[PDB]
Amino acid sequence: DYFNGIYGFATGIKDIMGMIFKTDTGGSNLTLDEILKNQNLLNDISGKLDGINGDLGDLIAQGNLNSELAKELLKISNEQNQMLNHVNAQLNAINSTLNIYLPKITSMLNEVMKQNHVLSLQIEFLSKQLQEISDKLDIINLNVLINSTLTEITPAYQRIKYVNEKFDELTSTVEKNPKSYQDNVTKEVIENLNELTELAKSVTKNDMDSFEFYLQTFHDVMTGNNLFGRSALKTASELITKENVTTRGSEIGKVYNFLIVLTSLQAKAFLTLTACRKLLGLTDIDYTQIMNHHIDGQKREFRINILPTLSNNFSNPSYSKNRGSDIDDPIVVLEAAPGYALIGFEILNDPLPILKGYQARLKPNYQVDRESMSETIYGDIHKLFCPKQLEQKYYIKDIEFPEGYVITKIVFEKRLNQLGYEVTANFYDPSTGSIDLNKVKVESWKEKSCEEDSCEDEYSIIKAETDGIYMPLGVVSETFLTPIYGFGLTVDEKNQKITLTGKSYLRESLLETDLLNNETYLIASPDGYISSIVENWNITSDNTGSWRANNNNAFVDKADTIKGSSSLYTHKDGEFSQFIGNKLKPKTNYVIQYVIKGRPAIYLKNNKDTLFEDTKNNFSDFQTVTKKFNSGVNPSEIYFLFKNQSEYEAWGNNFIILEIKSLEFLPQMLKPEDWIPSGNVQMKDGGRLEILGDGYFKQFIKLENDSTYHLRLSVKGTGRVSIIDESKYLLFVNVKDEDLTRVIKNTSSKGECFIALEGTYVENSSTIFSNVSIVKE
Amino acid sequence: DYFNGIYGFATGIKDIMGMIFKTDTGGSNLTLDEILKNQNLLNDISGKLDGINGDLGDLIAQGNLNSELAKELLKISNEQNQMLNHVNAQLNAINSTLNIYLPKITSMLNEVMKQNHVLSLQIEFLSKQLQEISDKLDIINLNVLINSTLTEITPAYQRIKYVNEKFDELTSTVEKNPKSYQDNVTKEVIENLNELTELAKSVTKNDMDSFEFYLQTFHDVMTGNNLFGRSALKTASELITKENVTTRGSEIGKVYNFLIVLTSLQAKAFLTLTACRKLLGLTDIDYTQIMNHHIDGQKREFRINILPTLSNNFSNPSYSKNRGSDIDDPIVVLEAAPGYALIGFEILNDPLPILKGYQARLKPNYQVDRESMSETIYGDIHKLFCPKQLEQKYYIKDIEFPEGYVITKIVFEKRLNQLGYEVTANFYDPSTGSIDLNKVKVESWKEKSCEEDSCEDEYSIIKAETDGIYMPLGVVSETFLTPIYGFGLTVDEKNQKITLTGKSYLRESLLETDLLNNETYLIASPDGYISSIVENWNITSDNTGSWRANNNNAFVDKADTIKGSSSLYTHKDGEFSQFIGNKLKPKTNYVIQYVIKGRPAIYLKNNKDTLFEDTKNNFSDFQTVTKKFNSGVNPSEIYFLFKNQSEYEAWGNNFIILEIKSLEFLPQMLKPEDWIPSGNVQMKDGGRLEILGDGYFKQFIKLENDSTYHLRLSVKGTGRVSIIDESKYLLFVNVKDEDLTRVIKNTSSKGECFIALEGTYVENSSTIFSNVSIVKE
């Protein structure tokens, strides 16, 4: 969805305050002292004693009686009236409370709970994100300045977080007015009474020589007004900018995220304080002024003396050793739509090495639209990034366009292990969010020698080791998706690892909107996918939409196994159905992912073939799994079939399936169609040209004198290859199972030559070729 | 301005504490500001009694009874009414009591806030300077002490600062005051019993095993009466005096700033305690004596076992790289008026490399007068400190003097890149001030004379790189200006750093005054200029006896503290005229400096020429401008014109215009007037001998065969230098546009010896030399 930034969050908390600030208390002195469990018991005493006292008082008021007897009875009347009066006073306090106050207070509290929950959904993400950041940071070589802020802040932070947690949860677990805690029977007045008493005790403890001291000093330490003025913000900046912290997002991303965490903490605490006050008696204190002032102070700090020092450069978070190829010329294009813009990348490998690219339209001041977003998946990216036992040329540049431009299309080129690329940017307007389509800039070469002389040099090379090259792995994006104006590759072959890097507009993307208190619209980096062919794959709304269950044991049930999320539940016959055939293009790969608990029965069936089925694994706690498959020759009828099992209990949701864009290649001289078989030989889909025994393939191929040619191919099954010009062997090599790498030098093929793809000559032989590549140098 | 020391601040605090100790009413002379508790109790009793009396009275009104059975009821009614009159007397007494108590309290708090602000203004400056240490105190290697001490001290410090800020909210109640000062006619009884409950709470949090405790233990640690001694002050010194703090002032100045901060904090906290206890009823215990006790204890500690360990040495704060020169022999004289003495230096670079020095009279015990101070600006000092393209010699020579002596004139001399300097001090009486003019000392470069004839030894040399050397930059003084007895230069050509350093009387300048609580008239080190040809150069307030507001809207924008500090204001016609043509001297460079916001029209003219203008750069908030300009050929009529750039609103202040002392040179044998124009050649302003096309300048010069000579000159225009005897060419070199460095050995002279400054045969490019320097070695 959206994250409306710290200013919008503060406005939300201020509106919650303005709501609770007004409603009512009637004074009503909610002191816990009231026994509050004898509203029944005292009533009996009150009634009986009232009757007795009335009878006796009327007997006296009859008059006409022995004088001293009258005095005696009058004294008895006085005593009884005193006892009864204090008793009914206690009862009247209790009952006045349990009729006037608890309904009012319960209503206001129930109201404050929901909006609190809503605002907590605005930072749920960054919570876990800062948890992860804390996991991967090391404080070696810290200065005394660090220990300074640590001891200056840690108790206040401890207690502020603790109180926010405790109160916020107690807002929920307090019975609401349905019971009204009334005298109804009992044990409602044990448990709901215990919880109400605990709420009372907590809120009471918030008015003393503490917790308006803790809040204030916390704010001060943040702003950096302590005994020698070292804002914890700055020391956190220093700690984060220290390396070994290579995770998603750049410096600015991480520090701003930190400040989001802390500011949300402070605002939550202010809300809690005001709620406590109103929950007690009187003297409401409009804290909104102080809260806004403190938030603006911390933001001014962050803006002035930290932000201009940080980098928007962001790298892949991890690496991975992988075996790629050399006989191929893979070319990859990531071209956003004409009205779109690149907004980050991601590399996954678990189904297969896959680069993913997001794209979207732009809103002013470098803000992204939630919709119009799109994820695109690409194929064997390792084959572009990884060799197989041969060196790799990597041209490395810090390509960056001028300000106002946005990287709009990144095309990759690997030509005979020379890895360059193409970065093209368009013009964009921050004031209107509009991206121009008629003012572009291009970058064809990827070094500094071409940067200063337009001459080809200054790449870097990697000598292919055995196990595999450390290729990029993980997410390539800022913590908040953002159009980038800088990009580059910075491989360090010293240890055989590659690294991508870009420069983000995040700085200016926020400096115009948030730190100036305007409507901010960011988007947290999507941890997983965002779209799917399965419509409403994210079943949560208790509605199936295109989903369909043909059995009442298959139901939607937002609280399938828990109210936290829905996961289509099926037991012993439960089947969730969805026609999906119309969207899967034939002969195309697809990756599948879903979070499943139990052992469900999953099917991709067109009533004739089940393109995929998994019915084996049993998952206690919603294990997600990912598999792949290629669409059949005609999947136009395939359904989605979430069945339960033969019989079992099943859970499952977020059934994501996406097209894996097949990897393409550069042109060559060879053509998979110009081949000439010679009996007992059959070519395959990938121009494989398998020798089915005794026979061969050939294809006439024209050469020139002053041109160099690189012949590359691999075979499945032993065989041979021969380039005979007309009688002379321009080449003749025996190959068993390996990648041919011969490079024919300057030689004018007389007339025409051809490659006699002759494998071995026995009956049971199968010499299958892979990549008939005669790429000319 | 002025600053009256820790003792003066304690005097102010004690004065105000006495003031509040003597102002109140009684009433609570028998109560404890439970005036309210008894007041409400009495009110309830009056209400119930009145309700009873009403029923008795109307039952009487029914009448129709026996006389005695009525007359007895009549007597009972009389008794009840008299009882009600009695309680009404009591309650009216209480009403009048609190009705006097409250408004006096309000007025007292008003006065407390005013005077507290007036005092805190006198530490506000030196509070900020503590951050100039904060940024550069990244100190390590003994951090265990500054972990222990901080972990032990910082809670009490936080709490004290918090309590203090409760008096900004006191100021908020001061703001409230005018809303209820007028309706004090028995309406306050619940109006102004609210509207201050914040304070009524804060004060209650000043008892009971609490804040008093924190103040006490804080004092105890600062003095160092802890478990193991080690006052936080000692470790604070051990931190601040170490590891490249490299900011103005010495160990003494900085540690003293620290102690000023701490003692000022404590004094303000004691004032707050007593102000609270004067409110909230009364007990009237003057903490005066205890406060003076604690302050004197901390001062005794600081004097005894910290002050001796400190040094009065101090470096310049910053360096700057600037291409200097070797063709010039710059001589600089820094001499005070006879009744004055130098108190510190300052190097500015922004409008130009410029050296500033302050000189002033003396108050006894090494103190300085406010209005006797004066600033002086000298020219391009890089020409004195930095070479160009050659080496340069520097007489590192740590001059000193006996006590009672004070530096009075420092003369700088760069001769053939030999940099030495003569320092001339005078004698002075610590008592009565009275520098005497007849007991002087001169130690120029001959501190080696006592043991070695080579007075010219004990120096160093730097080789000029292509871009210049790190010349000193910033302020040369102690945190408080002070006549210095020590001075020297300690260049480090290992990193091309030139360093100025001296010794300050600070130790003595205070050891007799502040640790003895006497007068302590100090001056904090300024941060910019303090004098200007512009009178009231900032603004006084509402009064611009220097300025002439020709328009009406050309008023003072804030005119009183509302837009922060003073700023002239102009909009749509606005202008402030001020005739200054009498204070400018023709053909003299003058520095311009001022702070502005928005779009102003900067004008310096005599209605006949714009000597300077700025009509652009609409700044966000009060940006300062600093540029340069030369006085025209006749500035007698010029005056200032701060107008508005355009229809917009403008702001501006701190208009500074100062004369720059042009640089001076040692004498040399070549004379400009002795030049012989021989054919279409004329002299220039800078003595440049413009060779108009063809021709040459010549001038007879008697060289001697005993000494070595040095001719140097830079030219504009292709030319030839020609030193010929009557027969022989002693020198004949040609020059295009560059400098010239020639060393002639024993010059065999034949009487007719001269140099002919000849260009080349280019009629357009007039050959223009710069420095006719035949300086004799």
UniProtKB/TrEMBL annotation, chains A, B:
<dbReference type="InterPro" id="IPR022180">
    <property type="entry name" value="Vip3"/>
</dbReference>
<dbReference type="Pfam" id="PF12495">
    <property type="entry name" value="Vip3A_N"/>
</dbReference>
<protein>
    <submittedName>
        <fullName>Vegetative insecticidal protein</fullName>
    </submittedName>
</protein>
